[PDB]
Amino acid sequence: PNFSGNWKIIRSENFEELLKVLGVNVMLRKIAVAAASKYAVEIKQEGDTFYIKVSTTVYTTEINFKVGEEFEEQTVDGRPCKSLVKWESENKMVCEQKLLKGEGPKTSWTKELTNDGELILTMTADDVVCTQVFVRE
Ligand SMILES: *C/C=C(C)/C=C/C=C(C)/C=C/C1=C(C)CCCC1(C)C
Protein backbone atom coordinates (compact mmCIF):
# COMPACT_ATOMS: atom_id res chain seq x y z
CA PRO A 1 0.00 0.00 0.00
CA ASN A 2 1.01 3.57 -0.62
CA PHE A 3 -1.60 6.05 0.52
CA SER A 4 0.97 8.86 0.20
CA GLY A 5 -0.12 11.62 -2.14
CA ASN A 6 -1.92 14.89 -2.69
CA TRP A 7 -5.54 13.91 -3.16
CA LYS A 8 -8.28 16.10 -4.62
CA ILE A 9 -11.97 15.32 -4.23
CA ILE A 10 -13.94 14.29 -7.33
CA ARG A 11 -17.13 12.99 -5.73
CA SER A 12 -19.04 13.39 -2.48
CA GLU A 13 -22.20 11.52 -1.51
CA ASN A 14 -24.45 11.68 1.55
CA PHE A 15 -22.31 14.34 3.23
CA GLU A 16 -25.32 16.52 3.94
CA GLU A 17 -27.22 13.59 5.43
CA LEU A 18 -24.21 12.78 7.62
CA LEU A 19 -24.14 16.32 8.99
CA LYS A 20 -27.90 16.13 9.66
CA VAL A 21 -27.45 13.05 11.89
CA LEU A 22 -24.72 14.99 13.69
CA GLY A 23 -27.16 17.80 14.49
CA VAL A 24 -25.91 20.52 12.12
CA ASN A 25 -28.69 22.92 11.09
CA VAL A 26 -29.70 23.16 7.43
CA MET A 27 -28.03 26.44 6.41
CA LEU A 28 -24.65 25.36 7.80
CA ARG A 29 -25.08 21.94 6.19
CA LYS A 30 -25.50 23.54 2.77
CA ILE A 31 -22.46 25.76 3.34
CA ALA A 32 -20.44 22.74 4.47
CA VAL A 33 -21.38 20.71 1.39
CA ALA A 34 -20.18 23.63 -0.71
CA ALA A 35 -16.85 23.74 1.14
CA ALA A 36 -16.39 19.99 0.57
CA SER A 37 -16.34 20.51 -3.19
CA LYS A 38 -12.96 22.20 -2.93
CA TYR A 39 -11.32 20.04 -0.35
CA ALA A 40 -7.98 18.24 -0.39
CA VAL A 41 -6.28 15.51 1.63
CA GLU A 42 -2.52 15.19 1.81
CA ILE A 43 -1.16 11.90 3.10
CA LYS A 44 2.35 10.84 3.98
CA GLN A 45 2.64 7.16 4.83
CA GLU A 46 5.73 5.36 6.17
CA GLY A 47 4.97 1.77 7.19
CA ASP A 48 1.96 1.98 9.54
CA THR A 49 2.60 5.61 10.50
CA PHE A 50 0.36 8.15 8.77
CA TYR A 51 0.42 11.91 8.52
CA ILE A 52 -2.79 13.31 7.08
CA LYS A 53 -3.59 16.96 6.38
CA VAL A 54 -7.20 17.82 5.50
CA SER A 55 -7.81 21.28 4.02
CA THR A 56 -10.61 23.42 2.62
CA THR A 57 -10.47 27.03 1.45
CA VAL A 58 -10.16 28.58 4.94
CA TYR A 59 -9.35 25.69 7.28
CA THR A 60 -6.71 23.01 7.63
CA THR A 61 -6.32 20.16 10.15
CA GLU A 62 -3.55 17.59 10.63
CA ILE A 63 -4.08 14.00 11.77
CA ASN A 64 -1.14 11.89 12.95
CA PHE A 65 -1.46 8.25 13.92
CA LYS A 66 0.11 4.81 13.96
CA VAL A 67 -2.12 1.85 13.09
CA GLY A 68 -3.12 0.02 16.26
CA GLU A 69 -2.30 2.92 18.55
CA GLU A 70 -4.96 5.12 20.10
CA PHE A 71 -4.78 8.83 19.32
CA GLU A 72 -7.03 11.83 19.76
CA GLU A 73 -8.73 13.73 16.96
CA GLN A 74 -12.14 15.28 16.38
CA THR A 75 -15.37 13.90 14.95
CA VAL A 76 -16.70 15.36 11.68
CA ASP A 77 -18.95 17.85 13.50
CA GLY A 78 -15.99 18.88 15.66
CA ARG A 79 -16.41 16.93 18.94
CA PRO A 80 -13.07 15.65 20.35
CA CYS A 81 -12.74 11.86 20.35
CA LYS A 82 -10.38 8.94 20.97
CA SER A 83 -9.55 7.06 17.78
CA LEU A 84 -8.03 3.70 16.85
CA VAL A 85 -7.21 2.64 13.30
CA LYS A 86 -6.85 -0.97 12.17
CA TRP A 87 -6.20 -2.55 8.77
CA GLU A 88 -9.13 -4.41 7.24
CA SER A 89 -7.12 -5.60 4.23
CA GLU A 90 -4.01 -4.66 2.26
CA ASN A 91 -5.33 -1.28 1.15
CA LYS A 92 -8.18 -0.42 3.51
CA MET A 93 -8.14 0.83 7.09
CA VAL A 94 -10.95 1.52 9.51
CA CYS A 95 -11.09 3.95 12.41
CA GLU A 96 -13.42 3.64 15.37
CA GLN A 97 -14.06 6.74 17.46
CA LYS A 98 -15.13 7.21 21.08
CA LEU A 99 -16.34 10.56 22.44
CA LEU A 100 -14.06 12.17 25.03
CA LYS A 101 -17.02 13.94 26.66
CA GLY A 102 -20.73 13.17 26.56
CA GLU A 103 -22.86 11.19 24.13
CA GLY A 104 -23.83 11.14 20.47
CA PRO A 105 -24.12 9.00 17.32
CA LYS A 106 -21.62 6.18 16.74
CA THR A 107 -19.02 7.55 14.34
CA SER A 108 -16.21 6.01 12.32
CA TRP A 109 -14.28 6.40 9.12
CA THR A 110 -12.43 4.27 6.58
CA LYS A 111 -9.84 4.95 3.89
CA GLU A 112 -9.24 2.69 0.93
CA LEU A 113 -6.85 2.80 -2.00
CA THR A 114 -8.52 1.17 -5.04
CA ASN A 115 -6.71 -0.73 -7.79
CA ASP A 116 -7.50 2.10 -10.23
CA GLY A 117 -5.72 4.72 -8.11
CA GLU A 118 -8.65 6.32 -6.31
CA LEU A 119 -8.75 7.07 -2.60
CA ILE A 120 -12.10 6.33 -1.06
CA LEU A 121 -13.02 7.87 2.28
CA THR A 122 -16.13 6.86 4.13
CA MET A 123 -17.46 8.61 7.21
CA THR A 124 -20.29 7.07 9.17
CA ALA A 125 -22.70 8.32 11.79
CA ASP A 126 -25.06 5.59 12.96
CA ASP A 127 -26.90 4.29 9.89
CA VAL A 128 -25.72 7.07 7.57
CA VAL A 129 -22.66 6.55 5.40
CA CYS A 130 -20.92 9.36 3.53
CA THR A 131 -18.65 8.29 0.68
CA GLN A 132 -16.05 10.61 -0.83
CA VAL A 133 -13.75 9.81 -3.73
CA PHE A 134 -10.38 11.43 -4.49
CA VAL A 135 -7.75 11.28 -7.22
CA ARG A 136 -4.08 12.19 -7.07
CA GLU A 137 -3.15 15.72 -8.09
C1 LIG B 1 -8.52 9.90 7.02
C2 LIG B 1 -9.16 11.03 6.38
C3 LIG B 1 -10.06 11.69 7.12
C4 LIG B 1 -10.34 11.24 8.52
C5 LIG B 1 -10.78 12.85 6.57
C6 LIG B 1 -11.60 13.55 7.35
C7 LIG B 1 -12.29 14.68 6.73
C8 LIG B 1 -13.15 15.46 7.39
C9 LIG B 1 -13.47 15.22 8.84
C10 LIG B 1 -13.78 16.56 6.64
C11 LIG B 1 -14.63 17.43 7.19
C12 LIG B 1 -15.29 18.58 6.48
C13 LIG B 1 -16.17 19.28 7.22
C14 LIG B 1 -16.43 18.87 8.64
C15 LIG B 1 -16.94 20.46 6.69
C16 LIG B 1 -16.11 21.15 5.61
C17 LIG B 1 -15.80 20.14 4.53
C18 LIG B 1 -14.98 18.95 5.04
C19 LIG B 1 -15.34 17.80 4.09
C20 LIG B 1 -13.50 19.30 4.95
From Swiss-Prot:
Instruction: Specify the effect of residue 30 to A.
Output: Loss of ligand-induced nuclear import
Which Pfam families does this entry report, sorted A to Z? Lipocalin
Q: Answer yes or no on keyword Endoplasmic reticulum.
A: yes
Gene Ontology MF terms in the entry: cyclin binding; fatty acid binding; retinal binding; retinoic acid binding; retinoid binding; retinol binding
Motif position, Nuclear localization signal: 20-30
Q: What does this protein do?
A: Transports retinoic acid to the nucleus. Regulates the access of retinoic acid to the nuclear retinoic acid receptors.
What is stated as this protein's family in its record?
Belongs to the calycin superfamily. Fatty-acid binding protein (FABP) family.
Q: What is this protein called?
A: Cellular retinoic acid-binding protein 2
Organism (species): Homo sapiens (Human)
The primary gene name is CRABP2
